[PDB]
């Protein structure tokens, strides 16, 4: 029951994102961590504090590029 | 490869949410659909257009329920 | 026999890298692509042209931080 | 969780290399070890200290002959 | 009808590590004789039959191991 | 992990040999044992001490009859 | 429907023989050929003309060593 | 791993025999048992003690009618 | 559509017989031929003219 | 491994019978059951106790109508 | 396109019948022929003229 | 192993019937069901209780 | 095989709307002397219908509006 | 392939009765959300139609009566 992300990466493109899960804080992890799954299947971690990540999340809800 | 949510429900509380995945449009589904997994394990579908759902998502990224 | 990486990401830390495979050009892919596997197990793609990536690769050969 | 390479071999040609993975030090192994997979499928171990191996790695990143 | 199993030859093989050494001669399958040595971990590695070390390694395996 | 050969046979002809594997001593077997696979597919065991067998092995390396 | 044995071998021991099949002449083969299956499972061809082979066959019928 | 023959039969003709296998004693069976396969495919058991059977076996080795 | 039995054998025991089929004459074969299948599975041909075979067949009908 | 015949029928003609199999008692069935296969291919069950059936069987052995 | 039944048999029991098909006359056959399939799977031919067969058919329609 | 007929239809003509199978009750179906196959090949379900169907069946047995 | 004749030898009746999975209407032409309707049920068994019949015409219009 | 989805992505119009070789009406169910009509022309090319449309309903009843 440790954190799934060791670190954060950046440069994620919205077109490639097949799914984006937001895992908040708790006994499982010290901080909130976001895991984005691409269309090929490879997962990639993201920063919830980052402005691009927050911009990407709200765009997925409204409508896709 | 059909849509996972048959319908949307409401009245979700942030404290109970263990994970929230956002599945956008594509060949798999006609519209964007959001699936929230609670701490007990039971999943529940949400509306991306809904104002509460959008408010819940941004709050999870920043900080605590 | 298509390319394994849809895109490149950045911000990789050397300490977290458990393995780094370099897949060159051929019938399988138009360009060279690098796939780094972290200690947790999650893979992440990298740019061979990038200066940090080239600096990370040579450091792994000589000796770890 | 022991080292995958018992020994090192030499005389590797760049044209034949389909993939080259660099596995650094850790709990898994005492030293850094490099595993090159050929186009036929047969794997072969390499020395990270060797000058040819270091020359082969940097050439794969830049471009193929 | 098969092609040759070895694309190239490598060297620096140690006798202690060799678990098995198969010698595949010429024929319809391949233009030249090719030797495939399987190590104790399981990883295979190709060898040169013309090489003096390889010929010295083969005869030593028959007589008795180091 | 017992010995593959129960006994040795003789009268092997070089022309018929498709492959000759030499399995040395270890935990798997008390003595070194040689297994020759013919062109039809039928395997046959050989004596490493035998002079003909040693003469056959060196001839395969140099060049075929 | 060709001959199963490319050649004959010798030095077979009766104790090791689990089964011995005698395949006579016909459209399938130019001459009579004998195939002995050992207890481990490995088959081995024999000469019907050979005196030891004929002595081995008659001994199996009467009673085993 | 029981005996393959429940009983013995007689009146076998050499011309009809396509194959004759001799299965000696062991853990598999209390006594030696002979199984003759005819040209049509139907198997038939034989007595190793019988004089005709022993005469049939030696004739197959030398040369067929 | 040739005859299934190349020859006849003898020494069949009733206890071992699991099934006994009688295939009469016709375009398929010049003469009547009997095929007995044992309990292990191995088939064996029999002579319909033979006295033991005729005695074995009638005994199977009445009782083992 | 139950009985193949649920019941017996009668009125079988010898001319139509292509094959007649007699399956005796055992673990497979409580009583002896006879299965007659006609020239068209359709099977039909018979009573071993019946006088016509016993008369039909003996006639097939001697010679056909 | 010949007749499926070479002959008729009798002694059919209603309890065992899983299906009963009635194939009338035509180019395919000179006369009407009835084919009854049992619960085990083995087919058996019947006479349409026979009184038992006609009695069996009407009983299947009404009730088992 | 469900019932083959979802419903019954009527207006079947005897001349068109190539085959008529009667499938009685059991584990396979709650009630008896009759399946008539026409000369063109198209199957059609029938009611065993119906008077015309019972009249059609007996007529096929006697003669076309 | 039989090429370009009428598919229905006769008409039947007593069709229920609930059971109908598909209903095809094949009009007149070189293929057939009269219009013929072929209804395919949910189990898969086809059944012919009369276009002149009042129930059949009532069934067709009901399928278009709603089940 | 696409198993058990709707066969028509959209509806078209301007169908002429003379060209129609066959007209199948596929109602609602697990296979599709709404009723959909597929008309096959004499050349072989299929074309989808609206069951709600007045021309389509007029075309269907005319095929039953006579061409």
Curated annotation (Swiss-Prot), chains A, B, C, D, F, G, H, J:
Disulfide bonds join 3-29, 5-45. This is KC(5-72). The chain holds residues 31 to 95 of 96 of the full protein.
UniProtKB/Swiss-Prot annotation, chain E:
Disulfide bonds join 4-30, 6-46. It comes from the Eukaryota. This is KC(5-72). The gene is Cxcl1. The chain holds residues 30 to 95 of 96 of the full protein.
From Swiss-Prot, chains I, K, L:
Coiled coil: none annotated. It comes from the Eukaryota. Disulfide bonds join 3-29, 5-45. This is KC(5-72).
